[PDB]
Amino acid sequence: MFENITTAPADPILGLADLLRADERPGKIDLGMGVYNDETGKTPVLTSVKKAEQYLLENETTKNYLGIDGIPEFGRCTQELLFGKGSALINDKRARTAQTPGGTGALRVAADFLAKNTSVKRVWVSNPSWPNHKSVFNSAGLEVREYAYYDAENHTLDFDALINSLNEAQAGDVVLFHGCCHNPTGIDPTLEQWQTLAQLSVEKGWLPLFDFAYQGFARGLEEDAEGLRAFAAMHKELIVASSYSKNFGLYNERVGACTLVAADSETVDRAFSQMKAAIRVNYSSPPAHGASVVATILSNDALRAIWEQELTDMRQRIQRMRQLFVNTLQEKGANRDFSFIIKQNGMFSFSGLTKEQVLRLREEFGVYAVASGRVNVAGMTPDNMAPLCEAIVAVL
Amino acid sequence: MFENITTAPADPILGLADLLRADERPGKIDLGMGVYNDETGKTPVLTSVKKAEQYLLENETTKNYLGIDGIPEFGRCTQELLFGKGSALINDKRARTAQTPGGTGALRVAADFLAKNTSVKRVWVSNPSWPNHKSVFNSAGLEVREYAYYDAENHTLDFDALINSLNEAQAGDVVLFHGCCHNPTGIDPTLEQWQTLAQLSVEKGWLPLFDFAYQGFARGLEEDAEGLRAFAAMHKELIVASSYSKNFGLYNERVGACTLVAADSETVDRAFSQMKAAIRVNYSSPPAHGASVVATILSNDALRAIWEQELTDMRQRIQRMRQLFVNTLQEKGANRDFSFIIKQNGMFSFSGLTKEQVLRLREEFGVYAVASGRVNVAGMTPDNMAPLCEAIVAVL
Ligand SMILES: *Cc1c(COP(=O)(O)O)cnc(C)c1O
Numbered sequence: 001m002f003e004n005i006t007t008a009p010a011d012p013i014l015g016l017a018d019l020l021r022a023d024e025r026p027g028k029i030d031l032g033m034g035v036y037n038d039e040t041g042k043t044p045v046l047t048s049v050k051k052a053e054q055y056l057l058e059n060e061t062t063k064n065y066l067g068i069d070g071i072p073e074f075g076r077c078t079q080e081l082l083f084g085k086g087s088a089l090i091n092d093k094r095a096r097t098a099q100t101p102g103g104t105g106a107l108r109v110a111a112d113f114l115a116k117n118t119s120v121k122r123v124w125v126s127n128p129s130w131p132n133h134k135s136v137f138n139s140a141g142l143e144v145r146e147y148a149y150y151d152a153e154n155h156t157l158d159f160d161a162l163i164n165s166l167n168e169a170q171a172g173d174v175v176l177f178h179g180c181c182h183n184p185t186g187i188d189p190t191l192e193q194w195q196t197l198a199q200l201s202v203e204k205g206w207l208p209l210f211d212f213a214y215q216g217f218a219r220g221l222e223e224d225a226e227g228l229r230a231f232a233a234m235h236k237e238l239i240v241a242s243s244y245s246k247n248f249g250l251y252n253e254r255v256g257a258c259t260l261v262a263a264d265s266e267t268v269d270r271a272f273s274q275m276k277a278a279i280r281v282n283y284s285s286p287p288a289h290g291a292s293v294v295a296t297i298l299s300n301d302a303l304r305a306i307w308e309q310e311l312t313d314m315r316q317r318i319q320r321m322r323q324l325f326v327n328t329l330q331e332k333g334a335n336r337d338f339s340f341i342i343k344q345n346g347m348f349s350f351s352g353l354t355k356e357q358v359l360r361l362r363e364e365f366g367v368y369a370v371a372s373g374r375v376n377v378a379g380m381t382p383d384n385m386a387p388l389c390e391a392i393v394a395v396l
Numbered sequence: 397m398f399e400n401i402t403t404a405p406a407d408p409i410l411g412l413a414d415l416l417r418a419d420e421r422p423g424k425i426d427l428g429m430g431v432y433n434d435e436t437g438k439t440p441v442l443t444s445v446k447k448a449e450q451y452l453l454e455n456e457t458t459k460n461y462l463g464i465d466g467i468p469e470f471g472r473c474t475q476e477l478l479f480g481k482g483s484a485l486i487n488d489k490r491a492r493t494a495q496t497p498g499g500t501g502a503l504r505v506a507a508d509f510l511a512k513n514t515s516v517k518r519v520w521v522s523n524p525s526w527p528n529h530k531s532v533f534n535s536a537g538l539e540v541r542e543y544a545y546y547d548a549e550n551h552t553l554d555f556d557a558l559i560n561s562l563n564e565a566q567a568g569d570v571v572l573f574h575g576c577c578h579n580p581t582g583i584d585p586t587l588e589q590w591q592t593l594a595q596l597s598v599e600k601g602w603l604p605l606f607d608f609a610y611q612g613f614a615r616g617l618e619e620d621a622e623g624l625r626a627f628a629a630m631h632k633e634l635i636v637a638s639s640y641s642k643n644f645g646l647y648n649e650r651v652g653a654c655t656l657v658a659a660d661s662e663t664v665d666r667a668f669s670q671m672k673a674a675i676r677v678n679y680s681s682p683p684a685h686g687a688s689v690v691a692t693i694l695s696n697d698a699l700r701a702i703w704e705q706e707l708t709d710m711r712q713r714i715q716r717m718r719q720l721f722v723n724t725l726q727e728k729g730a731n732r733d734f735s736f737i738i739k740q741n742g743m744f745s746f747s748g749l750t751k752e753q754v755l756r757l758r759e760e761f762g763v764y765a766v767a768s769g770r771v772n773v774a775g776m777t778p779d780n781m782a783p784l785c786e787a788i789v790a791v792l
């Protein structure tokens with residue numbers, strides 16, 4: 001049965017991990033997968049998280065199955081984080097949230113739900129975008145189209161090409177938007193552009209689907225949700241796939257959420273029943289530990305205060321490396337100006353390096369980045385900055 | 397977009413949970429979902445598990461993503477549990493294991509993998525079987541056929557109808573087998589019958605797929621794997637979807653595994669690469685906490701000793717309730733003989749009650765069981781046995 005199966009192509013992001021643990025050459029620098037590192041180059045467990053785990057160990061009395069949609073409190077805290085404490089969406093009970101296994105899990109559940117319960121056939125994604133986006137929607141049987149987004153020449157958001165590109169999007173098509181910290185460009189729309197998009201969306205009849213995996217890494221928790229809230233104010237329906245992997249440093253516990261919004265509570269309830277059916281035939285019910293930690297933290301004023309500060313520390317350290325990176329490149333005799341990197345938010349940065357330059361950095365210097373030229377600034381430390389910049393200068 | 401979505405039908409098993417927490421009538425008795433309860437009617441965290449969680453809290457230094465296939469040690473301990481310490485399958489490196497989110501997750505991953513990488517089009521399942529089996533395979537686009545299994549009249553395994561029924565299975569079809577503790581009948585094939593099936597399987601060219609969610613609940617860890625090992629000895633290829641939800645009482649942490657076996661290491665490696673591709677487009681990587689606990693326990697002689705005993709205690713308490721159940725029914729003036737229930741293993745028992753009798757038990761007595769007449773013996777306690785049996789006698 002398995003004789004003729006072909007070897008699957010390596011994942012553009014996850015595949016780097018395999019190359020790393022196969023490279024003896026010490027001094028390696030990992031700027032691939034989007035994981036936060038502190039000044040030491042380690043990815044520690046947040047203190048707020050350890051304290052929540054301590055709490056769960058002392059108070060958990062059973063591991064009995066959670067409902068298909070997960071921990072209710074988790075869903076509530078998630079909705080408040082997304083739409084705001086006194087949001088009308090919450091008061092009118094127009095939103096239902098299912099706890100899922102990571103942000104990827106949320107996107108997959110949204111995909112399956114749409115494919116077998118709606119007339120949706122096309123999903124529009126930005127060019128460029130997280131590579132797994134196309135793969136997930138295609139796996140559900142949905143076709144993916146791309147819309148212009150990044151201006152490679154000016155290293156900015158080409159809003160005119162975006163709008164014009166989307167005119168090709170028909171009513172009933174899904175349009176995916178990154179909530180903030182666009183992966184891989186790091187370029188997000190301004191508040192006015194979001195408002196223009198929200199308006200256009202309603203008029204063209206698109207179904208907005210937000211991928212929110214970096215809330216808190218651009219400017220702040222509330223500020224980072226302004227774009228989504230602009231859409232939520234004019235739309236009757238939308239879908240939000242969120243992730244807590246990065247802002248809680250809970251990567252391997254797979255904590256995410258898929259939020260569904262409809263015109264009213266009776267409609268979202270009916271729709272949600274079909275979303276739960278899609279979960280039952282996938283993994284049945286979500287993993288408790290990770291989500292339990294997030295709910296415990298967000299619902300406790302003491303722990304939430306600590307967590308919010310740790311999040312602020314992470315954002316500020318990336319902003320510092322982003323600065324040290326640009327200065328060191330210049331200081332090390334960089335060819336061109338990389339000041340544009342200062343205007344990008346999040347862990348990433350589209351460096352502008354070609355595939356060959358990325359390959360050479362890996363082959364000759366032990367510097368690992370994604371073939372697209374995407375680099376994880378969060379993987380930069382005051383200690384590896386020098387050799388990293390020297391390697392980059394050598395390939396320019 | 398969501399205006400015309402229809403309400404999904406309630407899950408035959410999970411739906412009971414909703415009815416329970418909507419029923420004021422105190423004294424309710426839950427014999428539905430397959431969850432273990434102790435003499436108190438509670439589902440506690442195993443002591444071995446709490447100790448492992450204590451260990452993880454003190455020693456975990458990062459929550460960084462696990463590989464797509466999960467924790468390597470977990471995979472190793474799983475293979476040893478399934479095939480045996482000195483198994484040839486392990487020595488020849490013919491098996492690859494992916495850590496998944498529960499046993500359901502393992503079945504879904506196996507389904508997706510088969511649908512897009514093989515010529516498989518049909519999956520044969522026993523009549524009756526866990527209801528979610530048909531739903532999971534159908535969701536992957538595979539058709540499901542049923543083969544005779546249970547003799548409703550004699551309350552035994554009709555081996556002749558099974559064999560004859562399977563002659564309709566073509567080479568290249570998948571045939572699903574419950575490793576032990578058949579859900580819902582509790583009737584498993586004898587070792588000689590397994591051997592006859594293994595032989596027939598090889599000859600007809602079927603691809604065996606074992607659902608192993610109750611290892612340790614029939615006779616013991618090793619004894620419960622005799623059937624699978626009989627197949628593993630004659631087959632070049634097979635798939636095993638296992639679950640640790642029940643034997644570790646880790647239901648809500650979603651810990652399972654999907655093991656793939658091929659003729660040789662180069663073939664299983666190629667095949668496995670495609671299985672990982674299927675995981676990447678679903679939930680990306682598995683939840684660490686649950687599996688970490690299982691690996692910590694199984695790899696530590698001290699903790700494994702405690703866990704094995706707790707497992708033995710669970711099996712023995714169900715065997716006692718199975719006895720007290722039959723005796724009390726007789727003692728309470730039961731109509732017919734339920735001695736056949738003593739010959740069934742696992743948490744369940746196909747009681748023989750009709751759908752109406754099950755509905756009446758729920759409506760008039762607050763006793764909840766699955767419409768098929770399946771009852772969770774593990775939910776019976778010395779305290780609820782009397783009222784439970786009185787209710788059953790009243791509907792006979
Ligand atoms: C990290 C990320 C996700 C989801 O990741 P999970 O690890 O599954 O939580 C989704 N979209 C983008 C753009 C991401 O960066």
Ligand SMILES: *Cc1c(COP(=O)(O)O)cnc(C)c1O
Pocket residue numbers: 283284430497498499500501526574579607609639640641647651652
């Ligand atoms: C419990 C069970 C499963 C899988 O359950 P998970 O909770 O997803 O681990 C699969 N098959 C049968 C027959 C089961 O009883």
